[PDB]
Amino acid sequence: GDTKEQRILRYVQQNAKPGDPQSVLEAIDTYCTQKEWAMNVGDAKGQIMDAVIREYSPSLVLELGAYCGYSAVRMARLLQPGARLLTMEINPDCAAITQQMLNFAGLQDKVTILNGASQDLIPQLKKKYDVDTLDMVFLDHWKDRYLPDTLLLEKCGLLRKGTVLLADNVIVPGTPDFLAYVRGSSSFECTHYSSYLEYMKVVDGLEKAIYQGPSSPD
């Protein structure tokens, strides 16, 4: 069998318009809706992502996780000239499709795909990828890494006061430990957004968690 991601790219290349990111997003959602691939229909969560990008105008965004490139296209299309999206993905085959998707959208120059495990790459951002602090982090990778990677970003000095974390799929299948941490911590100011999943007909959600600076040494 062909993978979902390679079939999504096939559909985009044959139906979307090159250099037209909206047409790419719509083609992905159209195809995934037809196939009833609920986790790959991104328009509902995309509305929330777009509003965050529009409000905060981040210059440097870290994306954790990529499958077919939908979220990278969604974010990169709203980033300013000169901005940078760093996208970490452990599966090289997903990284490959994501790269091809960005090329078709004409957005490749704004994005750097890093193929590897987030916990290995995060400690390299400062010295190897010339990062000071991140303006935004989009969490959409392995569920059990949301909390550990947040703690790792903190420890590596990659978050500043005002850094916006936006976490996807916090309800389904869920990231309850991550939610409990950010909601209970004085280092984060949190907002929850409902986001519907078709077929399962359930309200998933995203969490926006804005870093406030580290806890007191007292």
Which residues of the shown chain bind K ion in the complex (CB under 5 A)? Answer: 185, 188
Q: Cα 124 from chain centroid?
A: 19
User: Shortest Cβ distance from residue 174 to K ion (Å)?
Assistant: 18
Q: Which is nearer to K ion, 188 or 211 (CB)?
A: 188
Tell me how far apart the alpha carbons of residues 196 and 42 are, in angstroms, rounded to a whole number: 10
Per annotation, catalytic residue among 35, 126, 143, 154: 143
Q: Which is nearer to K ion, 26 or 189 (CB)?
A: 189
Per annotation, catalytic residue among 43, 140, 204, 207: 140
User: Shortest Cβ distance from residue 208 to K ion (Å)?
Assistant: 11
Q: Which is nearer to K ion, 188 or 193 (CB)?
A: 188
Q: Is residue 196 within 8 Å of 169, Cβ to Cβ?
A: no
Whether 177 sits among the annotated catalytic residues: the reply is: no
Q: Which is nearer to K ion, 91 or 185 (CB)?
A: 185
Per annotation, catalytic residue among 40, 43, 169, 208: 169
User: Shortest Cβ distance from residue 215 to K ion (Å)?
Assistant: 11
Whether 154 sits among the annotated catalytic residues: the reply is: no
Ranked by CB distance to K ion, the top (closest) residue is: 188
Whether 143 sits among the annotated catalytic residues: the reply is: yes
Whether 55 sits among the annotated catalytic residues: the reply is: no
Whether 168 sits among the annotated catalytic residues: the reply is: yes
Per annotation, catalytic residue among 5, 168, 204, 207: 168
Catalytic positions are 140, 143, 168-169, 198
